Design a protein around this ligand. Structure first.
Ligand code: HEM
Ligand SMILES: [K+]
Length: 291
């Protein structure tokens, strides 16, 4: 399988900035979602989920094909709750029907991150919608009740090393877990719709208590009222992951640069960008544009 990036015919930077702006304005407007958290977090998750089905071994899955739009994928148990981000984006796609699905799902995550004060994430267009049959089977997304070895191993399938895994996990500072969705409940910090290194700080500074939740699943609960999944907790159990946690707890910039590189890589996995392809775009946030 080779998936070559193909620019939406005759669209340029300016065209994409517009899609961005549309997402951004809508994020601003629909702020009541999930008790005032907003749709930022769910979009980040959407982008990650359409991208994590990737398999470095045969090149199946990944964001290119926009397969999330098909039933098999959309109904994946691991994607429970993502339907809210889809619906959010739907009117957007209607406004700009020439964008591919993969491009839109991915752009929304980038947009989400940046509007939430995160770092700038360079983004590339060119994903192409593929047929129903290119839809990966369910089961390629990770489980939350495991440990550091699982995480290490899981992530390797995506070509991500230790440093990338830890940077990527910091997105867990955002949003929260929802019982009806994954059998987990609670946020992991206080700033859950602003992008920061909070995840790392919480992991190192709170006093976590293992407990079983209403769904009969274990989770690490803190006095402050926050939670961490076993997989999140595992970053402090592994000696190699811990030193990285500590690095990010200490320097938000390092965290931002690393996250940026990794998120882009995650969203570009499985895609071949030809030689003449435009460079990656760096979108202006609403604020940078005075909108
Ligand atoms: C071991 C790896 C991962 C596991 C097991 C995992 C599992 C989960 C779980 C169980 C939830 C809660 C879903 C719900 O009930 O609504 C979730 C939430 C979240 N996931 Fe992950 N995740 C991991 C990797 C990542 C990464 C790499 C990203 C992005 C870079 C991320 C982004 C998030 C976000 C932003 C939310 C909050 C969603 C919301 O507030 O609706 N996770 N994760
Ligand atoms: K969270």
């Amino acid at each position: 399988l080779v998936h070559v990036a193909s620019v939406e015919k005759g669209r340029s930077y300016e065209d994409f900035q517009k899609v961005y702006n549309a997402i951004a304005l809508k994020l601003r407007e629909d702020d009541e979602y999930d008790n005032y958290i907003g749709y930022g977090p769910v979009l980040v998750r959407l982008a990650w989920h359409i991208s994590g089905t990737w398999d470095k071994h045969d090149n199946t899955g990944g964001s290119y094909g926009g397969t999330y739009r098909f039933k098999k994928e959309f109904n994946d148990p691991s994607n429970a709750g993502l339907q809210n981000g889809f619906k959010f984006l739907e009117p957007i796609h209607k406004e700009f029907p020439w964008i591919s699905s993969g491009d839109l799902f991915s752009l929304g995550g980038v947009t989400a991150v940046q509007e939430m004060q995160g770092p700038k994430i360079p983004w590339r267009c060119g994903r192409v919608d593929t047929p129903e049959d290119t839809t990966p089977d369910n089961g390629r997304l990770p489980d939350a009740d495991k440990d550091a070895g699982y995480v290490r191993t899981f992530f390797q399938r995506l070509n991500m090393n230790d440093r990338e895994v830890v940077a990527l996990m910091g997105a867990h500072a955002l949003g929260k877990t929802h019982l009806k969705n994954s059998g987990y409940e609670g946020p992991g910090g206080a700033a859950n719709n602003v992008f920061t290194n909070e995840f790392y700080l919480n992991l190192l500074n709170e006093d976590w208590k293992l407990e079983k939740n209403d769904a009969n699943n274990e989770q690490w609960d803190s006095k402050s009222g926050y939670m961490m999944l076993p997989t999140d907790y595992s970053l402090i159990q592994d000696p190699k992951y811990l030193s990285i946690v500590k690095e990010y707890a200490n320097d938000q910039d390092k965290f931002f640069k690393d996250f940026s590189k990794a998120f882009e890589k995650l969203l570009e996995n499985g895609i071949t960008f030809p030689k003449d392809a435009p460079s990656p775009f760096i979108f202006k946030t609403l604020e940078e544009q005075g909108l």
